[PDB]
Each structure stands twice: as structure tokens, then as C-alpha cells.
């Protein structure tokens, strides 16, 4: 919640998991060359999913920061 | 008048200032204008 | 004569106060709009960022999410300004008329923008 | 790498100026507040 | 009217604080992810190695 | 005379003064002579 | 830690203003009382 | 940017003087009121 | 309150009911305003009688 | 009691806080015995001064 | 893009290929 009325809230969507769902980073077991190369294909995709998650956070506290400068000016002039 | 101080508006501005200040100092420490934080996530990515 | 004067005077003191509350109303509205402008400043910032090195920022997708978030802000700020439970500027505000003296229809019509979210 | 710096490498020779400005504001608005909070004090001390 | 204003104001101060704690939450999450990325950077380093 | 005090005219002037005072302080905080408020909306725009 | 301060760390640059207001009120209501307690004194001193 | 400041950037080295003037007026008119509200008091205290 | 969905609806409760209160307080507004006049008035009657 | 939306587990304490205040709205509701026939709780009979 | 207005851009024409087209 960021105001005074009901259901006035910012839903946030933290990534459900990090360990075994970044297929898995833990799945790979590099030791064979053919798995080294495919490993890179794994990490690349999943890393993109991470930095999408980090960028989701980008939108969320940017959203917060404005919201509170704004809210703060409201409670001011009220 | 005494019931309150409209000049607390000054305070608000300073809060923003200090926020900017801290972030600048972070950028000045590491030399990274894009903090490791999300901020400007495009260039970060 | 004095009864008419006291009529005028204390009536106009109340009308002064009604005007002062109106000043505050328009002030809060102004603050909300200032911050709408900070967002829109950011929206040009993001639209220009969204050149993407013309196609090189694949992660425009993240920017799209960023945009969506800011778009949602222009709904939240559009709501949440309930000076009266009859809030300022979103949806439908009915162009109200602040009295500033003691006589009938002696009022200042004000024309708050009917909406902010989906009509900018 | 040179690109990576053009992305990240703050031109802090400018951000120093921005920095001073922020420090400056902290100082100034503060002194303004040290003045501002004297107002109501005066108001009542005199009307009494 | 004022009772409604005080309602609004102090309610929104609390909501401001709830938001600030949220800012901190997302900040800590961000730090954790930064360092996940340092690892994954190392994972490509090791896959190429 | 007691029924009222014409010197409340003094009060009125001070109200104006305090208004100016507060606005000046705002301008001195942020360094913006045009407040984020509407005032002098041309230069603001 | 930064969160811990956002919870605890008073923005006393505001609470200073609140502080003055309280000190101010102590002073003012007091002087009002120094005036108020003179009322009954006058009432009787005159009706007698 | 330089234009943006010529628009916004208060020449507060002048507005400081304006500021003092306003603070000054608050003080002065106040003291005038502390004097003014003594007038009717005197009027009746004497005619009685 | 303890559940969030009850927090939000809780606000909807308190708002309405608080309006009923301050209506009650305003009922009192009319009543001693009514009294105050009534007794200045009555008092002037018993005077001139 | 948004709780950082789920982050204040100790809403439980808030619930207790709420309960206490709820009990106040009974105590103030009682305890106003101007006459042994107190003001506003339960049933007051709409009297006529 | 190199300014703030729409379609204010520098088209670039990288060679479509290097391997089999030189």
C-alpha cells in the first residue's frame, strides 16, 4: 500500500525461485565439452531472465520514489 | 501562526536532495554511473 | 444599516474561508500535476532510450515493463486525491464554483481536467 | 570495454559539481529551517 | 472536513512508511540479484574455461 | 474606544507579509524562483 | 541497515519543527494561564 | 541549461534581502499589535 | 484486521461509521447553538418582563 | 496492517492493539453516567429539554 | 537517434555479410 484507501497497492512479482529455476543452472555438470557449450546456452537465457527481474525492480522503486515525492506533496498541501 | 509550519515544505525538498546526494556518492565511489542497483536498468542490462 | 453591515461582514468572512480552502484544493491539485510532469518527463526519457541503439537494446522488454509501471502511476495519481471523497481530477469532476463573497452566484468556476489516466 | 565505460563510467568530473550542489542544498535548506522554526516562537512571545 | 483531512494525512504518512520499508525490501533483493549475476558471469567464465 | 480595533488593519498587512515570506522560503530552499506551483506559469511552461 | 534507519531514524529535521511547536505551546498556554487566573481576582475585587 | 537557470535560478542573493524584509515586517507589525491591543484597555481603565 | 483483505475492507468500515459519528457531533452543533441563542433570547425576555 | 503486504508477521501484535482500542469504544461507550442514565451507549431514550 | 525528436536518427549500413560475399 502507498496511500490511505483500500486496495491501493503496488503488486510486486519477485522471481519465484533462484536456485533450480534459473534447464537449471544446477543441472549442467559441465565436465564434457558438449555440455560446456550447451551450458553457455543455458546460462545466457536464464541470466536474461534474471536481469529482467532486476529491471522489474527498476520499475518498482522508480514507481515508489515518484509515488512518495507525490504523496508527500499531497500530505503537504492537505 | 503556531498550529503548524508550512516551512516543512523546505524539509521535503531536502529529503529529495539527500537521496540524490547519497546516490551520487555511490556513483563516485565505484565510478559506475549506473549503480549495481536497478536504476537505468536498460544500460545496466 | 448596521444589521446589513454585519450581514455583509461575517458573511464575507465565511466566504473568505471557503476561498482559502479552495486555494488549498487547487494547491494539492497542482502538486499532483507537478509529479505527473515528472513522470511524463521520464516518459520522453524512456521513449528516447527506446531507440535502443536503434535495435541493440533487446531489453526494451524491461523498458516496456518500466513504461507499464509509470503508466499505472498515471492512474494512481489520477485516483488518491480524495479532497472530499469526491476527488480532484480523474474520471468525472463536475466543474465546481467557489463562492468568494456574500451574494448568490458570486462564484469562481474551476475546470479541473476531467481525467489524467487514459486521456493524456 | 570502451563501450562498457561509456555506459558505466561516470563523468564524475561533472558529478562532482552535482555533488557540491547537493551538499550545498543540505546546508542551505538546513539553515533556512534553523531560521524557520524561530518564526512561531516570535509570534507568540510577542502577542503575549 | 478537517477530521477527514487528518484521516487522510496521518494515514498517508503511515502508508509512506510502509512504502519506504518496501523500497528497502526491493533494495535488498536487488543486491542479492547483483551477486547472482556475478556468479553467473563466473559460470560463463568457467564454461568457456 | 472599545467596540473594535481599527488596528486589525495591521493584522491584514502581516497576513500578506507571511504569505510572501513562506513563498520566498520555498524559492530559497529549492533555488527555483518559479515554484513548482503554477505561479508565473509562463516561465514554468 | 538502511531499512532499519527508515524505520527508526527520525527525520528530526522535521521533528525539530514539531519540537519548537511543543515548547511554544508550553510557553503560550502558560502565559494564558497567568492571565486566566487574574480573572476571578478582578471579578470580586470590583463587586465588593 | 543556462537558460533554464535564467528562468528558474533565483538570484537569491537578492531574495535574501527580500527575505529579511518579510521577517522584519512580521516582527514589526507584531510589536505594533502588542502595543495596539493595549489601547482599549487604557481607555476604559481611565474613564472608569 | 489480521488478514490483508480485511485490512482494506476495514478501512471501508471505519470510514462510513466515522461519518456517522461526526454527523452525531454535528447534531450536537445544532443543539447547543440552539441553546445558546435560546438562552440569550429567553434571558432578554425575562429582562424586559 | 498492510504489513508491507505480508512482511509484518506481527500484525498479531497489531491485532491485539486493535482489540484494545475496540474495548475502548466500549469503555467510553459506558462510563458517561450523567444521571446514572448515561449518555449514548445501549439505549438512550431521546429526551426533551 | 541523436536528439530528442522522432525520426531524428542516423541510418547506418553495415555490410550485410563478410564471409561468402567478399
Numbering used by the authors:
A (entry chain K): 148 to 169, 385 to 440
B (entry chain g), F (entry chain W): 5 to 49
C (entry chain A): 50 to 169
D (entry chain g), G (entry chain U), H (entry chain W): 441 to 488
E (entry chain K): 50 to 98
I (entry chain L): 392 to 440
J (entry chain L): 99 to 147
K (entry chain W): 148 to 169
What did the study's authors say about this model?
We found that these mutations also generate straightened filaments in this organism. Filaments from these two FliC mutants of P. aeruginosa were sheared off the bacteria, concentrated, plunge-frozen and cryo-EM imaged. For both the L- and R-type P. aeruginosa filaments, we identified three pseudo layer-lines in the power spectra from the filaments, besides the 1-, 5-, 6- and 11-start layer-lines that are similar to B. subtilis, which correspond to non-helical perturbations. We obtained near-atomic resolution reconstructions for the D0 and D1 domains for both mutants: at 4.2 Å resolution for L-type filament G420A and at 4.3 Å resolution for R-type filament A443V based on FSC of the cryo-EM density map with the resulting filament model. The three L-type subunits of B. subtilis and one L-type subunit of P. aeruginosa aligned very well in both D0 and D1 domains. From our structures, in P. aeruginosa the D3 domain extends along the 11-start and forms a dimer with the D2 domain of another subunit; while in S. enterica, the D3 domain extends from the filament and does not interact with other subunits.
There are three parts to the flagellar structure: the trans-membrane basal body that functions as the motor, the connecting rod and hook, and the flagellar filament that acts like a helical propeller. Our current understanding of supercoiling in bacterial flagellar filaments, referred to as polymorphic switching, is based upon the notion that protofilaments within the flagellar filament can exist in two discrete states, that differ slightly in length. The “short” state results from a protofilament having a right-handed inclination (the R-state), while the “long” state results from a protofilament having a left-handed inclination (the L-state). To reconstruct filaments at high resolution, all protofilaments must be “locked” into the same state, either L- or R-type, producing straightened filaments that lead to non-motile bacteria.
